[PDB]
Amino acid sequence: GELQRKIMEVELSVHGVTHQEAQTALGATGGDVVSAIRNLKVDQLFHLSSRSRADAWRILEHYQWDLSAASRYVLAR
Ligand SMILES: [Cl-]
Ligand SMILES: [Cl-]
Ligand SMILES: [Mg+2]
């Protein structure tokens, strides 16, 4: 149904996210897939960059919400 489809969409939209993390994120947004994906992308980048969560958000914005591009940026030496 809708809820299964939504959890799958979240999990497939964010590299590295588990099914459990997708469910938790979507529960926190009341089933709003777009907000769950945003929050999970920030989370993933935050854990990869060990920056502040607001700085991870700012990097994601600079990369036009592309987590792959933002992640390659934070990992570049
Ligand atoms: Cl996003
Ligand atoms: Cl590059
Ligand atoms: Mg389960």
Ligand found nearest the CA of 24: 3
Please, is 16 exposed, middle or buried when counting C-beta atoms within 10 Å of its C-beta (0-12, 13-18, 19+)? middle
Angle at 32 between CA 28 and CA 34, to 5 degrees: 110
Distance 65 CA to ligand 1 centre (A): 5
- Residue 40 · residue 48 · CB < 8 Å: no
The set of residues, in sequence order, having a beta carbon less than 8 Å from that of 62 and lying 6+ positions away, is 70
Half-sphere exposure of 53 (CA within 13 A, CB side): 6
Domains and CATH numbers, the chain: 2-75 (1.10.8)
d(C-alpha 23, C-alpha 33), whole Å: 10
d(C-alpha 61, C-alpha 1), whole Å: 32
Ligand found nearest the CA of 36: 1
Token output for 63: 């990369």
Half-sphere exposure of 61 (CA within 13 A, CB side): 6
Could you tell me where the beta strands, DSSP code E, fall in the chain? none
